[PDB]
Design a protein around this ligand. Sequence first.
Ligand SMILES: Nc1ncnc2c1ncn2[C@@H]1O[C@H](COP(=O)(O)OP(=O)(O)OP(=O)(O)O)[C@@H](O)[C@H]1O
Ligand SMILES: Nc1ncnc2c1ncn2[C@@H]1O[C@H](COP(=O)(O)OP(=O)(O)OP(=O)(O)O)[C@@H](O)[C@H]1O
Ligand SMILES: Nc1ncnc2c1ncn2[C@@H]1O[C@H](COP(=O)(O)OP(=O)(O)O)[C@@H](O)[C@H]1O
Lengths: 603, 318, 408
Amino acid sequence: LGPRTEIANRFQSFLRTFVDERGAYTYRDRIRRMCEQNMSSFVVSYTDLANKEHVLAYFLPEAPFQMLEIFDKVAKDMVLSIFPTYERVTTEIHVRISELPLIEELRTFRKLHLNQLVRTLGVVTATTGVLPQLSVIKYDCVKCGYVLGPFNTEIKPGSCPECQSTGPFSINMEQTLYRNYQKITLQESPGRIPAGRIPRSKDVILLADLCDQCKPGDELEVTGIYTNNYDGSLNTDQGFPVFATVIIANHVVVKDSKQVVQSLTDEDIATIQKLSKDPRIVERVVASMAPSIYGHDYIKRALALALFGGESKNPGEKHKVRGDINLLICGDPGTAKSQFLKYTEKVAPRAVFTTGQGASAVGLTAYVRRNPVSREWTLEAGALVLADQGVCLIDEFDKMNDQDRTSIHEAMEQQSISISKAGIVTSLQARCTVIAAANPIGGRYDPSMTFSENVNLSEPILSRFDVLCVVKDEFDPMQDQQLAKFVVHSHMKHHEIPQDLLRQYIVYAKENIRPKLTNIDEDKIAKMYAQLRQESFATGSLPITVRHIESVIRMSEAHARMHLRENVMEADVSMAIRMMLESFIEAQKFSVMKKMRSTFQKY
Amino acid sequence: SSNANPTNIRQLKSDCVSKLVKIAGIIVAASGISAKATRMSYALPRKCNPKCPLDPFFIMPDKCKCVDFQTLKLQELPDFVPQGEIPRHLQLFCDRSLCERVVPGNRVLIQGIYSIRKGVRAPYMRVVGITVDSEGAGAISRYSNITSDEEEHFRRMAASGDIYERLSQSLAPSIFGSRDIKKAITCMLFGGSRKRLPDGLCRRGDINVLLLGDPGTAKSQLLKFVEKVPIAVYTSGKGGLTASVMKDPQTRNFVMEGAMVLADGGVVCIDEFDKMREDDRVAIHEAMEQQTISIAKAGITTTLNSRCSVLAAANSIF
Amino acid sequence: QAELPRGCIPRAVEIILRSELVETVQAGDRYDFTGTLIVVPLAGVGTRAENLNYRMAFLACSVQATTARFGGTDTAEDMKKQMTDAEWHKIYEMSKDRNLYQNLISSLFPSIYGNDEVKRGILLQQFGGVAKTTTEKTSLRGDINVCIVGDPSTAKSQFLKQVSDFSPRAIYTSGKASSAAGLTAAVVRDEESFDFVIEAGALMLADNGICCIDEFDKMDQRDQVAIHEAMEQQTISIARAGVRATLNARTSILAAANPINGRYDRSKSLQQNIQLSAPIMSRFDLFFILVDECNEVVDYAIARKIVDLHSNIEESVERAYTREEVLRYVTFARQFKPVISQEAGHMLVENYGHLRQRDTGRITVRQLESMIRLSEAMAKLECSNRVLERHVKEAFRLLNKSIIRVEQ
DNA sequence: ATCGATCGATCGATTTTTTTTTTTTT
DNA sequence: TCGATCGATCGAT
Ligand SMILES: Nc1ncnc2c1ncn2[C@@H]1O[C@H](COP(=O)(O)OP(=O)(O)OP(=O)(O)O)[C@@H](O)[C@H]1O
Ligand SMILES: Nc1ncnc2c1ncn2[C@@H]1O[C@H](COP(=O)(O)OP(=O)(O)OP(=O)(O)O)[C@@H](O)[C@H]1O
Ligand SMILES: Nc1ncnc2c1ncn2[C@@H]1O[C@H](COP(=O)(O)OP(=O)(O)O)[C@@H](O)[C@H]1O
């Protein structure tokens, strides 16, 4: 046709006419970017469409099926023409959309939203597994033994190799194309409810390129399109025809983004190596760690480290060693510490929702024998399974039922679970990171008087814990003036890094680079651990074990990761040993200088 | 068979259908042995062969045939992204001579095919000439392709009278010391004699292990290693005192699914007999002295049995 | 329930609504519908014909979902919006009077007489917070706790039995009226839809409004230990039935404690006058306890309050300010975007330093957070932005009343 | 003598539910 | 035992 040809032709004169990012427009190269990796999930910007040709908003809703099909033909006739070798792997394409100027909450859509462009979100619940489908109409003639030929509706023409005969037929289990399939149950978040009632829900279908992407209990973003089951048995009716509803999936965005994620600017991506090789920027960990609270540099830098690290270093056959680490700050009820942690949750890739008083650690509907009675009888074991290679947020350690804080005592080093008490004995890894900022016994805080006296956390656990910190406070007028000025200024927001980047710096650092160690001075750690244990025997000396001297060299690797050095010299090792001198002096007596006098020669 | 390359369950999709493959997984359990046959004297059409109406077909099963049928199973391996998930699994199919070829709880190589039975229609797979695994000896658990060479090397190792003090340093190529602790973590595997007699006394065959101590001495790695090195399983606490009298929603009966069962020639290791309370210690009070695991719940008294040993870690207060 | 007979069951009716009628009904409401009963397209063993056994049904196409309606704030005059504060003609006066503080204090408690110190404070709770424009640092909070303790029945409860009827969205009751389902919804373990449904409660039914309690002391330490976090980091979570439960409460509170022995014998510290767990007694930023004594003048004044409770003509005292104008002025006073540019904003450092010069003989800056919010509220009361240095001094006085009230 | 409507002999298609034993939490 | 299928048949045209 004349006009009804122009759609693909405008896509053709789009993907090499519209430009952003100072030349070499993305879709000139995004498509080959994706044909390299054998993905077949090209994605479109709507805002770019509004920037180039705003015509494609009214022409769409009258049948967006045909819009998407006329899209995919263009990707085919581009790619398989320009990469003719490609026609081996998949030989099929479709496109995606991720820019819509509207988020339609649930319980808001009706018959007016029929068969047209949508955006909606919510939460997953139980649904089916993974199954394939059909794709094409082909039969096998049974009178004359031929095949009828290739052709929610049946076709069955009389034309066929059997003298256009043989109304009868039979079917093979091959030579016809198939299609993966899966279902979902979309429920709305229990935050944005009508405050205390049942929720509403719809079902959704997603298709073959989109499977093993979702999961039970997840955050969500989908364009989708509104379906219409064409007949749920129209007949003598109820007080309602038995009609139903689905949305069909075009494109998802997940909100957690637990992978290496963001697409790349042409020049504003090497901002890493615009500054990251200068010396002073070790302490630029802190200038965007949490510009919140005047003092407290040490503990926040320590968190900044423990958020930065990860390594498996699995030797031959033995085990998985360790790459995620225990922290704590069992200080005092008042120090602004709660607030330290929320920056981690809103900044880091992967984490979890909990306070103290979780389950009994048995878990919400964990043990359940497997039948299709009671509608599949949901299974889970806690939450560490649900955030691996992420972090756990906990507070009020000293305020939990002991027999759950018991149960959490396996992940820490072994990083694994193992269960029974059903019809099953399946097993599973728990690889993630712990952090807690709880409160002790006794009101506020003792003086520099010892720790094991100061809170009822037993011996065979706080050994599994390694890196300690304590927010000790006492009264000086000067710093009280200083921080008061800081706070009042902090409520003068009326009307050196941003958070924009260290997210990406840590993704680059934790994913790609995989550092090591070399023989440098590693005998001296022996003397220092020996001084540690010999000068600390019975005072507060129970938590002097081998993981916290795993930690030192591992933290050195984390330091050089913060440099992307990929190896390291004495500098970061001395820094780690310095930090531990610091903390382990902090949590000992009013005679706070024992290791000080014992250590000025190293310092 | 072949040696091409193994795959993973997460790529079994529509394109890999009616087509040969190779994978590597792990097993949980599989069915019994009902039947299936080839011919006798699917649609069985209309004609008869005064009238004889509309499909009067009498099977002559004196003249029918008979082959086997077993329905094997497969779960994935623990290192192919179950991290943000749990492991899925699959059910299978086996035909004529390969029942009693795989007991559950083993590592497999597999040669199979992904084909259907009836557009949401169903999956399944069968064997197209199974073989097995060599995770060291991935499948060497019941049969023998060991050769006189292997028996020779073995028994030539046996008379070598510097093998036991050699084997007290075998488990840890990374840990120091702790040798008298270790001289009988290896004998626990070997087992002694299960000597029954003309009277009742089926006396206790295997042995059993204990340890409790302050952390910081490498308990966990050692027990994980004893799991690693013939067949065994591991949990620790939180799991049972009951056994599995559930009900298949098909037919509504009281079947017995049955996992000290799964160490009847293997063994078992656990940590935390401590931090699992007493509602599930009494069934295991019993099992490990007589091995006649009894059942008396509903109208069944099938006191089956299982020969298992046991290993115990612990944590004492303070 | 407007037709409550005896005998038979609550006979159920089927009933239908059209499109624009949809989703403006809700659970818990009494109605006025249409009456358009219809022919509805086993055990009915009557005679059968043809040239069939029906049941009963019904539809209706009109709604008056009354007894669940307030309407927010829209003198017919000019204003920011249509009717949000069209009473400028008088609100101009209600924002410029100099005795307005006391005229407001005595404008809601004419049927009451006691102390005159929480009649000047508790407007605090209904009054605004901050609502400022900042970055993604964190939540910044607007409203704050209050507490009451007292001797047996000096009208501890009539303060609040009415306050629920005073402002909207803020329904009150106790939680020991029910299970521990005050915080969480009813924990269910039988199959109706998917065997575990806990997405509600009763405390969280007060979002952007208050839901106070009575008998604050005798309640189990599960809801209460959950309160230990739920009031500041105003985001609550659970396990054992939670689809990684992420809720949000937002709101203030009012306490209803009762001493240990039911007396105020000053033989022990306050923290031992109640002898509970401690850290909670800071985030409650003002207590203002009511005391009992034995003096006849007060009690005769009370009885002569009852002299004008039932003398059916003029059974109360005259007043100066009516309630509706008060409430509308209050609900106008929030939407202002306050401002801070004042030397008190520069010079609160010495006020706090002096506060802790007195405390140089519990402690610190939770109270400070309160302080600047108490006073930014008392300047909201001045129908004005642009913080001033006097609301400071009043707030400082209230602070010191609270602490020296706590002092032995 | 051509053709549509009605009759009637010919064909194939439907018929499984109430207790129990473990399990998490008050 | 119920239903449409299909083929035959009887007046109109
Ligand atoms: N030194 C400080 N710097 C910045 N903000 C502070 C400081 N002290 C208190 N605050 C503010 O006070 C509020 C209380 O936070 P804080 O972490 O002190 O409570 P908390 O100690 O966690 O109490 P709990 O440990 O019982 O949860 C926070 O909003 C915080 O911003
Ligand atoms: N004697 C040792 N020699 C070498 N490495 C050791 C030794 N003991 C412990 N380790 C190191 O510490 C880890 C072992 O700790 P393990 O998990 O046994 O503690 P645990 O026994 O589980 O503590 P708990 O009994 O309190 O749980 C190993 O990963 C190992 O690298
Ligand atoms: N100053 C006062 N003004 C009005 N009523 C008062 C005053 N002092 C005491 N009362 C009376 O004291 C009673 C207190 O009862 P209340 O404390 O509500 O019982 P409970 O302790 O069971 O809640 C009120 O009913 C009120 O009549």
